[PDB]
Amino acid sequence: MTTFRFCRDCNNMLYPREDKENNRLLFECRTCSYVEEAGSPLVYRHELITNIGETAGVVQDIGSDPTLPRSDRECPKCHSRENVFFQSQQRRKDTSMVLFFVCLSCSHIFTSDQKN
């Protein structure tokens, strides 16, 4: 997973370059003389289809939203029976109807799909 690297001088992103006589990769800033040594042959990455598990999104202070439903399911960690539950907040067309539960006390996230 390629990460942007900024020059330590002027915060500009570092462009790759090659060293033929030593055959090694370096990152240089086109505005200044800073040169740093590349730690991996991985500089860029272009994935096509996202195999990302669906995420509940923002969770902070979600228990104060009064338009969000409730349930009496039991917490797997703190053994509490009060929690908030909602569907996946990522708006893809093909998302399944798998729930997400956020516990009221310990703020623990879990799902209704207990696949082993």
Partner: protein, 168 residues
């Protein structure tokens, strides 16, 4: 008569239970997507089919109850005014209001009306009228029925002109 009302309510209840069970199955990632058709579409298709069959069966019970000296039944039998759909709606139940071929979509964010809770998929929350014209409509199903009627009103009012141009 009262017994016919009893079977009507029982049929409505059993359809509601079937829909609830399908919802429970789909919420646990156990439901299987149908042939060449998304999971959400499969859930919606099951719900719609269940509710429509419930309305039809209740209507047929209420129609079979009626005697021969009923005036509406006499008019329908003669062939002059009405059909069994009219009898079903005035007596058994109105049914499922739709808009553009689908149930009442989410106009707000993740609900259909401020009186519900976010991510609600129950039939009564998505435009199902389980009452009748003789019993009376509650406000939400009244609103959904109003949208259903508005669609056809618009249809007539404009496609008059389009058809006129084509005819000329």
């Amino acid at each position: 008569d009262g017994p016919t009302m009893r079977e009507i309510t029982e049929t409505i209840a059993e359809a509601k239970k079937k829909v609830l069970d399908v919802t429970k199955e789909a919420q646990a990632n156990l439901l299987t997507a149908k042939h060449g058709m998304t999971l959400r579409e499969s859930f919606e298709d099951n719900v719609v089919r269940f509710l429509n069959e419930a309305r039809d069966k209740a209507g047929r019970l209420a129609e079979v109850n009626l005697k021969d000296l009923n005036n509406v039944k006499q008019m329908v039998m003669a062939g002059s005014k009405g059909s069994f759909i009219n009898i079903a709606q005035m007596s058994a139940c109105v049914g499922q209001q739709s808009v553009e071929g689908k149930r009442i979509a989410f106009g707000f964010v993740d609900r259909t009306l401020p009186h519900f809770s976010k991510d609600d998929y129950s039939p009564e929350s998505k435009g199902f009228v389980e009452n009748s014209y003789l019993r009376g409509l509650t406000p939400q199903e009244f609103f959904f029925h109003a949208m259903g009627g508005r669609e056809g009103l618009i249809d007539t009012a404009v496609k008059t002109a389009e058809t006129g141009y084509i005819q000329r």
